[PDB]
Ligand SMILES: COC(=O)[C@@H](C)NP(=O)(O)OC[C@H]1O[C@@H](n2cnc3c(N)ncnc32)[C@H](O)[C@@H]1O
């Protein structure tokens with residue numbers, strides 16, 4: 286089923302967009318957990334990483350490359366953390382695959 | 398040397414021990430020595446890349462493969478309630494081994510924020 290991230294891709298509700306191409310969208314998280322906290326999502330509706338297909342490998346890697354490029358553009362020269370959450374135990378909040386990128390502060394261990 | 402001389406390069410070449418879950422021509426999945434969850438493993442490329450910030454555009458398929466292998470290993474390990482994947486960059490990310498590594502953590506409720 287559709288999610289709020291689908292609405293964001295479709296431009297039906299606003300988001301602070303950082304980057305877009307034909308296959309993904311990066312935008313600041315509405316509930317940021319670090320001074321910089323953004324998401325990179327595919328335009329293809331993959332509901333969760335556990336159901337991603339082998340043919341999705343380059344698209345998933347594209348999310349990470351876009352994420353690291355956006356992190357550099359946003360000035361995260363001291364580092365950052367990338368996160369993908371799966372399911373209940375993973376704390377996944379939206380059933381549309383989304384890569385979190387967090388920085389601008391020390392990230393701690395364990396990662397939740 | 399193929400894989401570099403970080404401890405992960407040593408693990409790739411079987412020069413120091415590891416508890417391996419899965420291995421192919423592109424990557425290796427093995428359990429973390431300091432687990433932060435009941436199940437906590439790493440997926441690393443066999444190609445040495447020091448950190449995600451220096452990955453090349455042509456590394457997209459390899460990076461995605463780490464995630465596909467991670468999710469397949471999580472299923473094979475029975476993490477049916479979910480899990481969290483983590484890649485750390487540099488000092489603020491907490492990176493400690495400069496060879497790209499994807500963490501997969503599960504078997505308990507993970508909390509927010511993720512550190
Ligand atoms: C502060 O460092 C960290 O915990 C994370 C955040 N940094 P990191 O660079 O993201 O993760 C490196 C991980 O590599 C694991 N490790 C280190 N030596 C071995 C080994 N010989 N076999 C298996 N796992 C090993 C550590 O316990 C870390 O969790």
Ligand SMILES: [Cl-]
Nearest residue numbers: 370377378379
């Ligand atoms: Cl999420």
